[PDB]
Every structure is written in structure tokens, then in C-alpha cells.
Design an enzyme around this catalytic site. Structure first.
Site, PDB file in Angstrom:
ATOM      1  N   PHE A 299       0.870  -1.320   0.003  1.00 31.26           N
ATOM      2  CA  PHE A 299      -0.079   0.095  -0.073  1.00 31.26           C
ATOM      3  C   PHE A 299       0.884   1.009   0.149  1.00 31.26           C
ATOM      4  O   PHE A 299       1.985   0.940   0.048  1.00 31.26           O
ATOM      5  CB  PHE A 299      -0.764  -0.081   1.429  1.00 31.26           C
ATOM      6  CG  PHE A 299      -0.288  -0.213   2.560  1.00 31.26           C
ATOM      7  CD1 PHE A 299       0.145   1.083   3.112  1.00 31.26           C
ATOM      8  CD2 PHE A 299       0.412  -1.283   3.101  1.00 31.26           C
ATOM      9  CE1 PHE A 299       0.858   1.063   4.393  1.00 31.26           C
ATOM     10  CE2 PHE A 299       0.725  -1.494   4.246  1.00 31.26           C
ATOM     11  CZ  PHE A 299       1.289  -0.242   5.099  1.00 31.26           C
TER      12      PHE A 299
ATOM     13  N   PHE B 133       2.305   4.009   2.067  1.00 32.63           N
ATOM     14  CA  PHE B 133       3.478   3.578   1.250  1.00 32.63           C
ATOM     15  C   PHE B 133       4.291   2.583   2.248  1.00 32.63           C
ATOM     16  O   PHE B 133       5.116   2.844   3.131  1.00 32.63           O
ATOM     17  CB  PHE B 133       4.309   4.980   0.879  1.00 32.63           C
ATOM     18  CG  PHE B 133       3.767   5.865  -0.039  1.00 32.63           C
ATOM     19  CD1 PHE B 133       3.060   6.910   0.641  1.00 32.63           C
ATOM     20  CD2 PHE B 133       3.706   5.553  -1.154  1.00 32.63           C
ATOM     21  CE1 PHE B 133       2.346   7.879  -0.244  1.00 32.63           C
ATOM     22  CE2 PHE B 133       3.162   6.399  -2.140  1.00 32.63           C
ATOM     23  CZ  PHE B 133       2.538   7.541  -1.557  1.00 32.63           C
TER      24      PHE B 133
HETATM   25 CU1  CUA Z   1       4.679   1.710  -3.713  1.00 36.47          CU
HETATM   26 CU2  CUA Z   1       6.490   2.700  -5.431  1.00 36.47          CU
END
Ligand code: CUA
Ligand code: HAS
Ligand code: HEM
Ligand SMILES: CCCCCCCC/C=C/CCCCCCCC(=O)OC[C@H](O)CO
Ligand SMILES: CCCCCCCC/C=C\CCCCCCCC(=O)OC[C@H](O)CO
Ligand SMILES: CCCCCCCC/C=C\CCCCCCCC(=O)OC[C@H](O)CO
Ligand SMILES: CCCCCCCC/C=C\CCCCCCCC(=O)OC[C@H](O)CO
Ligand SMILES: CCCCCCCC/C=C\CCCCCCCC(=O)OC[C@H](O)CO
Ligand SMILES: CCCCCCCC/C=C\CCCCCCCC(=O)OC[C@H](O)CO
Ligand SMILES: CCCCCCCC/C=C\CCCCCCCC(=O)OC[C@H](O)CO
Ligand SMILES: CCCCCCCC/C=C\CCCCCCCC(=O)OC[C@H](O)CO
Ligand SMILES: CCCCCCCC/C=C\CCCCCCCC(=O)OC[C@H](O)CO
Ligand SMILES: CCCCCCCC/C=C\CCCCCCCC(=O)OC[C@H](O)CO
Ligand SMILES: CCCCCCCC/C=C\CCCCCCCC(=O)OC[C@H](O)CO
Ligand SMILES: CCCCCCCC/C=C\CCCCCCCC(=O)OC[C@H](O)CO
Ligand SMILES: CCCCCCCC/C=C\CCCCCCCC(=O)OC[C@H](O)CO
Ligand SMILES: CCCCCCCC/C=C\CCCCCCCC(=O)OC[C@H](O)CO
Ligand SMILES: CCCCCCCC/C=C\CCCCCCCC(=O)OC[C@H](O)CO
Ligand SMILES: [Cu+2]
Lengths: 31, 535, 166
Positions: free
Chosen positions: C84, C86
Site C-alpha cells: 500500500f 507507502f
Molecule cells: Cu509503492 Cu513505489
């Protein structure tokens, strides 16, 4: 006979071969 | 008046080199980044609309890899055939085509310059940019459909006058090339038409990311051959004259080109080797056909090396290597494409690594990939475009190239070529160190410390190319086509290769066979998912 | 002169095209070989498996990271990874060495890399699909997960961790 052209494709084959065998090797190392 | 095809052809060149300059501005900054150096504060002061590394990266790829390349392709692969046939393109269409290009360019450039479409030049959903990016880009690319018509018009008109003649070489290149491009373009037109446009206008809520990728890479490979083949056309039919020799085989040239019409498109899964939901057997198949499409370039390497050798022995060079030094290293129109040709050796090489199914997992989405493709498009194509400036600009404007301007041109070519070599080393090497592509790494400086050495390469490349670029701006602002003869010695091959409709059919069938089964399964199981704006 | 050179250049080009073609075939044979070993595990299953990226953090195998590692064989584990913006769950992924690990990775937002550094794991993660891959970790320790598919402004700092135990 075209000795010069033959050289070029020689360098090519080798470049290709190093690249390809190079990475085949890394592949089995990482696998 | 008598050649207003020059005026249009010129407009195409100038806009693309416009696009190249603007695009490349971001290059040295991205190189320093891949040398662990953040110079973007500096950039965001000169160009304060730039809001991220990734917005700059979009600008860079879009302007350099799509805009320049295509405009150059349209310039060369319309004009050259016309001059070979000594005939006039439909100038109503040729200007329509340019305007669609210009107007489309402006229309997507707006969101780009506005941080509204910072997706990359791949725009993979669910990443969701401004409608005007997808509209703008749509119109830009379709400008080449018109171009396809122009040249098939030219060809048919000529064949009307001259039945029982085979197609002449340059034009035979141009026709198989534009036919290949139409075929190849459908996947992306499909993507825009069924998916991206409806999506960004708000008509649909999702796109299926797998199906968009698949339709994308249908187009996403042959587009590179559509970049390559203008440079090939020149390397085949002009270069051998620039060097002081001849083309050693006309059919050999046609054969390469025909192979490209057949094999440029049915290969896209080699961009999808790490994609889920695509069937491994189909990945092996595409791997096979991609090893096949490297053949016309293996072929090209020979035909062309042979042609250069012939030149350098005509010019009195003796040895294994005498012929090389005997060549016109004072003629930037010779030097630039020959240098690209050199860097294409390792570029082709890496290309053949990427195409092996399981070898891709070593390098996929690392810095290896950009390393590979700067050798191919950023050097061999671009240098071919750059050095052509020295015969093409006279032929279109009537303006001469001075000694001083010639010398400046040699320098740039060389600086640009060396830069590209150096960066290529840095990038392949970082990739083998599992350094990823499309990454603003200077911003995580303690992340890839095993990559210090190839990072030095990347910095050096950065300033080498900066200086190269700076010079090229200064030089460009300061400023009969030399078709080669063919050499003397099959009419059977040449005649068969001229059954062009036939070959077009085969190329069409191969796509159906290579993409059909998989897209049917994809369209039976679509899972559109919501868009995101993460910039 | 010329009629001799066009002959010779062409006679030799023909050998080159034969040769190159064979090298290409050898490569094909070598690629085939890899397909027949366990190293081929890292090739995604051919296999469509849809999921709802809107619910995947809220119901199902991805919704309790701490039970995402599941013995599915006597020497096989399936791991349900979410990638995802981040980052990755779980952090870390813990698996036993020498056990075959079936990774089932999806994303709830955009496309993500899953490149397990030091290995041949390197797969794309498409929202609404499950990517399936297999690896048997052969040395214990920390492996780093990198994201190598641009996914927004957090891309450069999106990493994860797999811990292989002995
Ligand atoms: Cu997750 Cu680039
Ligand atoms: C215009 C630019 C392009 C060319 C041409 C090109 C060629 C190839 N590519 Fe590629 N590449 C791949 C396969 C290859 C192969 C098989 C070829 C072949 O066409 C190569 C054939 C060429 C040769 C085998 C060499 C011939 C050499 C010659 C012709 C030298 C002649 C020398 C002379 C005559 C000099 C004489 C001089 C003297 C005087 C001595 C694959 C994988 O299967 C990927 C995906 C990787 C991944 O994981 O994503 C890929 C991805 C890329 C990317 C990244 C796309 C992205 O953004 O995701 C781009 C832009 C790119 C561009 C281009 N590519 N490529
Ligand atoms: C001054 C010369 C240039 C330099 C120094 C340079 C440098 C860079 C760097 C460092 C990257 C990698 C960035 C990343 O992966 O995050 C990049 C991206 C790219 N380069 Fe350039 N380059 C230049 C010119 C060109 C040219 C002429 C082309 C086109 C012909 C080109 C095409 C591309 C594309 C397509 C990308 C990838 C964009 C993406 O992944 O979305 N470059 N270049
Ligand atoms: C003409 C086209 C090519 C031009 C030729 C290339 C020029 C490169 C200069 C080399 C000298 C070395 C100077 C290095 C000294 C400065 C290095 C430095 O200060 O390091 C950066 C620092 O680590 C970050 O904070
Ligand atoms: C002129 C521009 C230069 C072009 C770019 C050149 C940069 C990389 C060159 C060749 C890569 C060859 C493959 C690299 C792998 C070889 C390393 C090796 O032997 O590794 C095996 C080991 O078991 C693993 O851990
Ligand atoms: C948006 C619309 C701009 C339309 C701009 C189109 C302008 C085309 C002018 C052109 O090149 O057409 C030649 C004309 O027949 C005589 O000059
Ligand atoms: C230039 C071309 C740009 C494409 C625009 C319109 C083409 C036709 C668009 C048809 C839109 C209908 C959408 C639809 O049927 O809705 C599906 C939705 O997922 C269920 O709620
Ligand atoms: C004719 C030229 C342009 C047509 C302009 C078309 C305008 C379409 C606007 C669509 C829009 O504004 O919807 C975006 C929304 O954010 C959904 O996510
Ligand atoms: C001449 C045109 C091309 C035709 C020749 C193409 C060869 C395809 C045949 C078998 C592929 C087998 C691939 C098997 C993939 C297994 C992957 C796996 O085991 O991962 C789970
Ligand atoms: C003529 C224009 C260019 C044509 C030809 C240019 C191609 C260069 C080929 C190989 C370069 C790299 C050399 C191979 C690397 C050696 C292996 C190595 O470095 O060892 C890895 C080890 O794991 C350490 O960490
Ligand atoms: C050892 C380390 C080196 C660091 C790399 C620096 C790179 C370039 C420096 C300047 C190079 C300038 C090359 C110009 C070549 C040129 O233009 O030569 C024309 C010739 O007549 C044939 O056409
Ligand atoms: C980091 C990597 C950097 C390495 C980059 C090097 C790659 C190849 C360099 C030059 C190729 C030029 C080969 C042919 C030489 C052309 C000049 C020549 O032969 O000179 C003749 C003389 O001018 C009478 O006319
Ligand atoms: C073609 C021009 C050659 C360019 C650079 C040569 C190699 C420079 C790299 C030497 C080491 C660089 C470095 O930064 O050192 C690694 C590490 O930090 C150790 O402590
Ligand atoms: C005179 C024309 C040619 C001259 C060209 C010089 C020869 C090329 C070698 C090095 C230059 C690269 C210098 C790069 C700038 C500093 C490198 C750097 O950033 O190093 C980081 C270090 O590893 C941790 O702080
Ligand atoms: C639409 C396809 C047009 C391109 C297909 C060409 C096949 C064809 O019919 O071209 C023969 C030519 O017209 C002989 O005068
Ligand atoms: C592990 C493998 C090692 C690879 C290392 C490089 C391999 C050689 C490269 C190219 C050979 C191309 C030349 C083939 C030409 C055949 C000769 C020929 O056709 O000769 C005709 C003449 O008329 C006589 O009668
Ligand atoms: C001129 C007469 C024609 C002769 C031409 C024959 C060319 C042979 C090339 C490759 C053979 C393939 C052998 C495949 C074995 C690969 C095994 C390997 O490298 O992997 C080991 C690893 O431990 C596993 O997990
Ligand atoms: C001109 C270009 C020259 C470039 C030279 C090429 C350098 C290749 C280096 C490594 C290849 C293999 C890298 C794979 C690393 C394996 C390490 C591993 O298996 O373990 C890591 C793990 O984190 C343990 O806990
Ligand atoms: Cu491709």
C-alpha cells in the site's frame, strides 16, 4: 572477405554473451 | 512553392527538438539523483512550477520519449519517401497532421505543467491524471494515423503510375513501417477509448489495471521500433553515402524492415513478466517472439558494418581496423549515428537479457532498464536525429553549416555519446545492485550504499550531459538529400517482400494469435478499481 | 571489384544470421530449463483472482496482518501481503528457512513493486488482483522489500522487511 564487419558482430556476440551468461548466473545465485 | 513539403517537414523537426530541449533539462537532475545527489532545490528555483522529481520525470519521458521521437518519425518517414519518389504529399493532410500534433501537445502540456498529470509516460491506472492529459495525448498520437494515410497515398499513386515496378527502397521502408505502426497503435487507442477517457471524464469509476497494462504494452513495445526505424532508414539509405561508400544490400534492408512489420507488435508480455493474471505459457511464447524480433537488428548490425567497411576501404583504409580510421570523422552526420550504433551493441545485448522470461526478474524495474533504453532511444535514435541536422537543415532551409558550426556539432555529439555511455554503466550497475527505476533516491541517501561506485558514474554523466545539452541549445539557436547508391550484384525475395498487403495480413493475424486468447479472458473478468491521485 | 564484394559480404552475412539464430535458440533452450526448476516459482501464477481493494483492509486474509502467515503444508507457508502507500503488512514478514513460501500480495490503492532484495522475487502488485509467487528462503536473516513501481511521492521511501528464521 569482410573482416571488418565480422569483427563488429564478434564484439556484438561477446557483448551479448557476457550480458546473457552474466545474468543467468546472477539469476541462479538469487534463486 | 515547389516544395512546401519542406516547410511542414521543418515544423516537425523544430517542435520535436523543442520538445527534446525542454525534456532533457530534467535529465542531468535525474542523473545526479542516480548519483545520490539532490539538486532539485536548484531546479525548483529556476523552474518553480516543478513541484516534484516525479513531475519532472513525467515531463522528461513524455517530451523526450513520445514527443521528440514521434515528431522526428513523422518528419523523416513522410519526407524521405516523398523525395525518393519525387512526389508531393497531401499538403492539406500534412498540415492537419502537424496541427493535431501541436494542438494535442499544448492540451496535455497544460496539466503536466500544473502538477495535474504526474503519472509517468506510462500512466498506469489506478494512477489518475487530468482528462486533458488523456485527451491531449489521444489527439497527438492519432496525428500519425493521418501520416500513415499520407504515405500509403503517395505509394499507391506511385504504384498507379508504375505497376510491374517493385516499391522503391526508402518508400518500401516507410510503408511497412507505417503499416506496422497502425497495427501497433490499436492497443493504446483501445486503452484511451474504452478506458482512460471515459474514466478521467468521470463516466466510469474504475479501470482494470491488468487490462489497461495489457492494452498499453500491445502498443508499448512497437512504439520503440517506431522510434528506431527513422534512424534505421537514415542509417541504411543515407549513412553509407555520408561515410564514402554504398548500401551493400537493398533486399537485406527490406528484409530487416519486413521482419519488423511482422514482429514489432505480438511481443508485449515481456513488459508483463512480473504481471499477475497473465498465463506463463503465454509469457514464454512472447519471450520466443521477442528473441525473434531481435533478428532484424542482428541482421542490421551486419549489413551496416559491412557498408561502413566498404566505405572505409574505398576511402583507402587497410587493415582489420584500417577501414575505421579511414572514415569521415569530421562529418557529424557520419559520426553521430555511428556512435549510437556503437552504444546499441550493449543496448541490444541488455535488451536480449530483458526478453528472457526468468532473467527479467533479476532486472525488472531496476535502474538496469533505463540504462538499457538510453542506449537505444536516448543515444542511437537521438544521435541519429542530431547529426542529420547537418544535411537536413540545409535541404529544408537553404541555410549553410559553417566550419565553426560543424565543429561545435562534432563536440556535442561526442559529449552526448560519452555521457550516455557513462550513465549507461552507472545505471546497469545500480540495477544489478537492486536499485529501482523511477525513484527519487537522493532523498533516501542512506538506502543504497552498496552502489557508491556506479553513483560516481551517474554524477559524471550528469554534468557531461548538462554541458552537452547547454552546447546543443547554443548551437541549435545559432543555426539533393544524400541518398546512397546500392552495390552491384535476388529479385525473387525482393518481389515477395513487395506483396505488402499480404505481409500486413500476416502481421495482423499474429497479433490476433498472440493477444487474442488473453484479452478475451481479461474482458470476461474485468475488475475496475477506483482512481488515485498520490502527488 | 564490387560484384566480388557484394558476393562475399552476403556469403558471410548468411553464416552470421545462421549463428545468431542458434545462439537465440540456445538461449531459448536455457530459458526452458529454468522453467523446469524450482527457481521458476517466482513467475506469477497465470491465474486471475479478483479482490475488492476497498474492503481488503476490512475483511479477509489481509485484514489481520498478525495472522497473515499460515502453514498450508508440512513444509509450505502462505503469506498474505498488503502492499500500500507507502509500505507493506506485515512488517516484518517472518518465515522459516527451507520452507516454501507462497506469497499472495495485493494493493488497496495503486500498483506497487514487490522486489525482495537479494532474491529473484520481483512482482507487480495490481489493485483488485492477487499476485501469487513462491520462494524457499535458503539463508536466514533480514531481506529488504523494495517498491520498484512508481506509486506517488512516497515511492522512494517505501520499503518492507522479511525476516527468515533458522
Ligand atoms: Cu509503492 Cu513505489
Ligand atoms: C528505441 C528504443 C528501443 C529499442 C530499439 C529497444 C530494443 C530492444 N528492447 Fe527495449 N527492452 C526489452 C527488449 C529489447 C529487445 C529484445 C530489443 C531488441 O530490438 C534489441 C536488438 C539489437 C541488437 C541485438 C544489437 C544490434 C546492434 C547493432 C545494430 C550494432 C551495429 C554496429 C555497427 C554497425 C557499428 C559500426 C561501427 C564501427 C565503425 C566499428 C524488454 C524485455 O523483453 C524490456 C522490458 C524490461 C523490463 O523488465 O521492463 C525493454 C524496455 C525498454 C524500455 C523501458 C520501457 C518502460 O518505460 O517500461 C524502453 C524505453 C526500451 C526502448 C527500446 N528497446 N526498451
Ligand atoms: C541530458 C540527457 C539526458 C539525461 C542525463 C538523462 C537522464 C535520465 C535519468 C537519470 C533517467 C532515470 C530516472 C528514473 O528512472 O527515475 C531518465 C528517464 C528517462 N529517460 Fe532520460 N536522459 C536524457 C535524455 C533522454 C532522451 C533523449 C530520452 C528520449 C529519447 C530519454 C528517455 C527517458 C525515459 C523514457 C525515461 C523513463 C521515464 C519513466 O520511467 O517514466 N532520456 N533519463
Ligand atoms: C565538459 C563536459 C564534462 C566535464 C568534465 C566533468 C567535470 C567533473 C569534475 C571533476 C573534478 C572533480 C571535482 C570534485 C570535487 C567536488 C566533489 C564534492 O564537493 O562532492 C560533493 C559532495 O559530496 C556533496 O555534498
Ligand atoms: C558501453 C556501455 C556498457 C554497457 C553496460 C555494462 C554494465 C554491465 C555490463 C555487463 C553486465 C553483465 C552481467 C552482470 C553479472 C556478472 C556478475 C557475476 O558474474 O555474478 C555472478 C554471481 O554469482 C552473482 O552474485
Ligand atoms: C484550436 C483551433 C486552432 C486552429 C488553427 C488552424 C490554423 C491552420 C493554418 C494553416 O496551416 O493552414 C493554411 C491555410 O489554408 C492558409 O494559410
Ligand atoms: C473519444 C471517445 C472517448 C470515450 C467517451 C465516450 C465513448 C462511449 C462511452 C460510454 C460510457 C458508458 C459508461 C457505462 O456504460 O457505464 C458503466 C458503469 O461502470 C456502470 O455504472
Ligand atoms: C472538446 C474539448 C474538450 C471537452 C471538455 C470536456 C470536459 C470534461 C470534464 C470532466 C470533468 O470535469 O470530470 C472530472 C472529475 O474529476 C471525474 O473524476
Ligand atoms: C514458435 C512460436 C513460439 C512457440 C514456442 C513457445 C513455447 C511454449 C511452450 C511451452 C511453454 C511452457 C511454459 C511453462 C511455464 C511454467 C511456469 C511455472 O511452472 O510457474 C508456476
Ligand atoms: C564497443 C562499445 C561497447 C561494446 C562492449 C561493451 C560491453 C561491456 C561488457 C561488459 C562490461 C562489464 C564487465 C563484466 C563485469 C565483471 C563481473 C563482475 O564485476 O563481478 C561481479 C561480482 O559479483 C562483484 O560484486
Ligand atoms: C578517464 C576519465 C575520463 C572522464 C570522462 C570525461 C568525458 C569527456 C571529456 C572530454 C571529451 C571530449 C571528446 C571530444 C571528441 C571529439 O569531438 O572528437 C572528434 C574527432 O575528430 C572524431 O570525430
Ligand atoms: C564509461 C565508459 C566510457 C568509454 C567510452 C568509449 C566508448 C568508445 C569510444 C570511442 C569509439 C570510437 C571508435 C572509433 C574512433 C573514431 C576516431 C578515429 O578513428 O579517428 C580517426 C582520425 O580522426 C583520422 O580521420
Ligand atoms: C570513466 C571515469 C571513471 C570514474 C570513476 C572511477 C571510479 C570512481 C569510484 C571510486 C570509489 C568511489 C567511492 O565513492 O568510494 C566507494 C566507497 O565510498 C568506499 O568508502
Ligand atoms: C577534464 C575533463 C574530464 C574530467 C572528468 C573527471 C574524471 C571522471 C572521474 C570522476 C569525476 C566525477 C566527480 C563526481 C563529483 C563528486 C562525486 C560524488 O558525489 O561522490 C560521492 C562520494 O562517494 C561520497 O560523498
Ligand atoms: C488499408 C490498408 C492499405 C495498405 C494495404 C496495402 C495493400 C494494397 O491494397 O496495396 C496495393 C497497392 O494499392 C497497389 O497499387
Ligand atoms: C560459446 C560460443 C562462442 C561464440 C564466440 C563468437 C562466435 C563467432 C561469431 C560469429 C561468427 C559469424 C561468422 C560465420 C561465417 C561463416 C563463414 C561463411 O559463411 O563463409 C562463406 C565463405 O564463402 C567460405 O566458403
Ligand atoms: C555445435 C554443436 C551443438 C552443441 C550446442 C549446445 C549448446 C549448449 C548450451 C546450453 C546447454 C543447456 C544446459 C542446461 C544446464 C543449466 C544448469 C545451470 O546452469 O543451473 C544449475 C543450478 O544449480 C540449477 O538450480
Ligand atoms: C560494468 C558493470 C559492472 C557491474 C558489476 C555487477 C555487480 C553484480 C553484483 C551482484 C550480483 C548478485 C547480487 C545478488 C546479491 C545476493 C546476496 C544474497 O543472496 O543475500 C542478501 C541477503 O540480504 C542476505 O541476508
Ligand atoms: Cu518492449
Amino acid at each position: 572477405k569482410p573482416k571488418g564487419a565480422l569483427a563488429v558482430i564478434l564484439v556484438l556476440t561477446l557483448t551479448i554473451l557476457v550480458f546473457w551468461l552474466g545474468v543467468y548466473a546472477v539469476f541462479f545465485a538469487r534463486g | 512553392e515547389a516544395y512546401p513539403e519542406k516547410k511542414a517537414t521543418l515544423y516537425f523537426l523544430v517542435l520535436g527538438f523543442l520538445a527534446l530541449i525542454v525534456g532533457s533539462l530534467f535529465g542531468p537532475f535525474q542523473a545526479l539523483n542516480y548519483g545520490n545527489v539532490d539538486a532539485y532545490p536548484l531546479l525548483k528555483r529556476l523552474l518553480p512550477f516543478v513541484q516534484s522529481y516525479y513531475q519532472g520525470l513525467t515531463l522528461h519521458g513524455v517530451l523526450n520519449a513520445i514527443v521528440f521521437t514521434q515528431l522526428f518519425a513523422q518528419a523523416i518517414m513522410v519526407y524521405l519517401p516523398a523525395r525518393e519518389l519525387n512526389m508531393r504529399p497531401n499538403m492539406g493532410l500534412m498540415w492537419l497532421s502537424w496541427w493535431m500534433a501541436f494542438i494535442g501537445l499544448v492540451v496535455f502540456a497544460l496539466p503536466l505543467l500544473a502538477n495535474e498529470a504526474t503519472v509517468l509516460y506510462t500512466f498506469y491506472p489506478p494512477l489518475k491524471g487530468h482528462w486533458a492529459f488523456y485527451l491531449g495525448a489521444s489527439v497527438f498520437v492519432l496525428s500519425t494515423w493521418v501520416s500513415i494515410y499520407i504515405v500509403l497515398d503517395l505509394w499507391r499513386r506511385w504504384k498507379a503510375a508504375n505497376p510491374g515496378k517493385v516499391t522503391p527502397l526508402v518508400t518500401y521502408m516507410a510503408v511497412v513501417f507505417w503499416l506496422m505502426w497502425f497495427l501497433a497503435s490499436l492497443g493504446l487507442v483501445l486503452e484511451f477509448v474504452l478506458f482512460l477517457l471515459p474514466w478521467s471524464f468521470g463516466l466510469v469509476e474504475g479501470v482494470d489495471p491488468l487490462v489497461a497494462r495489457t492494452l498499453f504494452w500491445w502498443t508499448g513495445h512497437p512504439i520503440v521500433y517506431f522510434w528506431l526505424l527513422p534512424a534505421y532508414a537514415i542509417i541504411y539509405t543515407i549513412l553509407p553515402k555520408q561515410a564514402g561508400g554504398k548500401l551493400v544490400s537493398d533486399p537485406m534492408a527490406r528484409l530487416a524492415f519486413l521482419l519488423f512489420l511482422l514482429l514489432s507488435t505480438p511481443v508485449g508480455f515481456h513488459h508483463q513478466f512480473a504481471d499477475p493474471g497473465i498465463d506463463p505459457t503465454w509469457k514464454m511464447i512472447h519471450s520466443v517472439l521477442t528473441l525473434f524480433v531481435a533478428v532484424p537488428s542482428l541482421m542490421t548490425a551486419f549489413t551496416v558494418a559491412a557498408s561502413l567497411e566498404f566505405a572505409g576501404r574505398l576511402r583507402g583504409g587497410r587493415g582489420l581496423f584500417g577501414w575505421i580510421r579511414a572514415l569521415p570523422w569530421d562529418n557529424p552526420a557520419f559520426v553521430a549515428p555511428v556512435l549510437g550504433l556503437l552504444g546499441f551493441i550493449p543496448g541490444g545485448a541488455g535488451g536480449i537479457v530483458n526478453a528472457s522470461f526468468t532473467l527479467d526478474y533479476v532486472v525488472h524495474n531496476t535502474a538496469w532498464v533505463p540504462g538499457h533504453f538510453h542506449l537505444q532511444v536516448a543515444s542511437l535514435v537521438t544521435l541519429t536525429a542530431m547529426g542529420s541536422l547537418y544535411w537536413l537543415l540545409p535541404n529544408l532551409t537553404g541555410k549553410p553549416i559553417s566550419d565553426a558550426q560543424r565543429r561545435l556539432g562534432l563536440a556535442v555529439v561526442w559529449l552526448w555519446f560519452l555521457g550516455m555511455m557513462i550513465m549507461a554503466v552507472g545505471l546497469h550497475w545500480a540495477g544489478l545492485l537492486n536499485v529501482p527505476r523511477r525513484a527519487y533516491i537522493a532523498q533516501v541517501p542512506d538506502a543504497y550504499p552498496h552502489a557508491a561506485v556506479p553513483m560516481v558514474f551517474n554524477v559524471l554523466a550528469g554534468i557531461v550531459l548538462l554541458v552537452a545539452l547547454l552546447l546543443f541549445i547554443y548551437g541549435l539557436f545559432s543555426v539533393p538529400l544524400p541518398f546512397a547508391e546500392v552495390i552491384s550484384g535476388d529479385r525473387r525475395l525482393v518481389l515477395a517482400m513487395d506483396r505488402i498487403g499480404f505481409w500486413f495480413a500476416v502481421a495482423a493475424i499474429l497479433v490476433v494469435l498472440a493477444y487474442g486468447p488473453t484479452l478475451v479472458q481479461l474482458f470476461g473478468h474485468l475488475n475496475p478499481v477506483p482512481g488515485w491521485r498520490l502527488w | 571489384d564490387e560484384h566480388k564484394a557484394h558476393k562475399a559480404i552476403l556469403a558471410y552475412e548468411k553464416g552470421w544470421l545462421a549463428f545468431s539464430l542458434a545462439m537465440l535458440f540456445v538461449f531459448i533452450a536455457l530459458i526452458a530449463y529454468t522453467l523446469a526448476t524450482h527457481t521458476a516459482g517466482v513467475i506469477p501464477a497465470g491465474k486471475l483472482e479478483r479482490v475488492d481493494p476497498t474492503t481488503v483492509r476490512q475483511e479477509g486474509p489481509w485484514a489481520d496482518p498478525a495472522q497473515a502467515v499460515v502453514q498450508t503444508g508440512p513444509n509450505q507457508y502462505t503469506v498474505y501481503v498488503l502492499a500500500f502507500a507507502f509500505g507493506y503488512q506485515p512488517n516484518p514478514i517472518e518465515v522459516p528457512q527451507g520452507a516454501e513460501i507462497v506469497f499472495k500480495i495485493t494493493s488497496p490503492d495503486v500498483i506497487h513493486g514487490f522486489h525482495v532484495e537479494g532474491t529473484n522475487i520481483n512482482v507487480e502488485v495490481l489493485p483488485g488482483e492477487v499476485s501469487t509467487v513462491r520462494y524457499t528462503f535458503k539463508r536466514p536473516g533480514e531481506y529488504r522489500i523494495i517498491c520498484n513501481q512508481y506509486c506517488g511521492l512516497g515511492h522512494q521511501n517505501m520499503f518492507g522487511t522479511i525476516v527468515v528464521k533458522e
